[PDB]
């Protein structure tokens with residue numbers, strides 16, 4: 001499981017945590033989030049996220 005940052009607002013999408021309040025179970029990989037899922041803080045699309053890895 002990995003972490004991805006919203007380049008706009010700094011929210012971390014943690015795969016371990018998911019986003020249950022917006023229909024995403026803990027353990028959902030970023031690639032598997034629906035194409036229309038957005039950052040729960042700022043509304044940015046998936047395109048605005050970057051994986052926190054080298």
Ligand SMILES: [Fe+3]
Pocket residue numbers: 006007008009010011039040041042043044
């Ligand atoms: Fe954001």
